[PDB]
């Protein structure tokens, strides 16, 4: 059984067009209480409904920030972020280079990264069993996971190279630009592409690690078991994983295959949906904060 599973939505900021930015046809009413949102007469409840007006730091105070405790009390964490494309899951998640952008448009990666340094390092005010920070990059693209750390980035990995992908030390929060540069002149990009950035903390003898999943939004338009695989298996895993058991289909998908050390017991998964306030994106919006109530479902 998985210790918690969370959902969080972020509206996306909406784009003024000549000035004029016109009302999200997404709701958050005066009872919200930063958990649920109303869209097309639909109120949906979450654990988090961050209205468009949410900063980052906001915004990973309220949902990492208690995954950073979990994590160094010896957790397996992962947040994942789905949605339509443009919605900012990338932005959300911190994928870009962090000395690119300013400091209060840095994503979730960098702030963690700067947590657990901090906590790591406030183990020195009583200097016991050293510790170590590790950074690993995977890209899925096309069923197929790559290790964008490696020396073979455009060569596909297997199953169990997976959870052996290398993983490079982190002597400071600062390393992390560098792994972030490197990863992404590594990668593929069908031209669209999944990213998995792991944070490593190993001691001696225990392994806990903070996956930051950034899912890609589907590409071009879609028509008038329906959507990501990998989104199907993580609640096919939760759901089995959660009554009986016997075999979890860590198979079923690459994604579900990745973080199978994380998706354990006693572990933590966190979704974030990110949908967009435009109208004409509503069959998206639906569809997103819809597969947010299964997940929560499986329990
Ligand atoms: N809350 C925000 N504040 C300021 N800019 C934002 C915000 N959210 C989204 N953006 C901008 O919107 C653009 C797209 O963000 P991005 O995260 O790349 O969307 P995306 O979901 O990753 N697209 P895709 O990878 O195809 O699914 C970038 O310029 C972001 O900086
Ligand atoms: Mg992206």
Request: charged residues 20%; proline residues 5%.
């Amino acid at each position: 059984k998985l210790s918690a599973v969370r959902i969080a939505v972020r509206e996306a900021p909406y784009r003024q067009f000549l000035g004029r930015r016109e009302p999200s046809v997404v709701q958050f009413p005066p009872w919200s209480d930063g958990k649920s949102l109303i869209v097309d007469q639909n109120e949906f409840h979450f654990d988090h409904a961050f209205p468009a007006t949410i900063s980052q730091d906001e915004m990973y105070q309220a949902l990492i920030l208690p995954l950073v405790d979990k994590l160094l009390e010896g957790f397996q964490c992962t947040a994942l972020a789905y949605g339509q494309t443009g919605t900012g899951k990338s932005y959300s998640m911190g994928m870009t280079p962090p000395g690119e952008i300013l400091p209060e448009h840095l994503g979730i990666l960098p702030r963690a990264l700067g947590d657990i340094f901090e906590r790591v390092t406030a183990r020195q005010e009583n200097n016991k069993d050293a510790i170590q920070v590790y950074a690993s990059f995977i890209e899925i693209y096309n069923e197929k996971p790559f290790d964008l750390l490696g020396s073979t980035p455009h060569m596909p990995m297997v199953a169990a190279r997976c959870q052996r992908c290398t993983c490079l030390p982190l002597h400071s929060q600062a390393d992390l630009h560098h792994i972030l540069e490197l990863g992404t002149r590594n990668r593929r990009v069908s031209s669209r592409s999944h990213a998995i950035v792991t944070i490593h903390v190993k001691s001696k003898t225990h392994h806990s690690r903070m996956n930051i999943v950034d899912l890609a939004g589907s590409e071009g338009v879609r028509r008038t078991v329906n959507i990501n695989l990998g989104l199907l298996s993580i609640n096919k895993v939760v759901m089995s994983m959660a009554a009986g058991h016997t075999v979890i289909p860590y198979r079923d998908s690459v994604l579900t295959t990745v973080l199978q050390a994380s998706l354990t017991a006693q572990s933590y998964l966190t979704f974030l949906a990110c949908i967009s306030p435009h109208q004409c994106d509503l069959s998206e919006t639906l569809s997103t904060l819809r597969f947010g109530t299964s997940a929560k479902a499986a329990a």
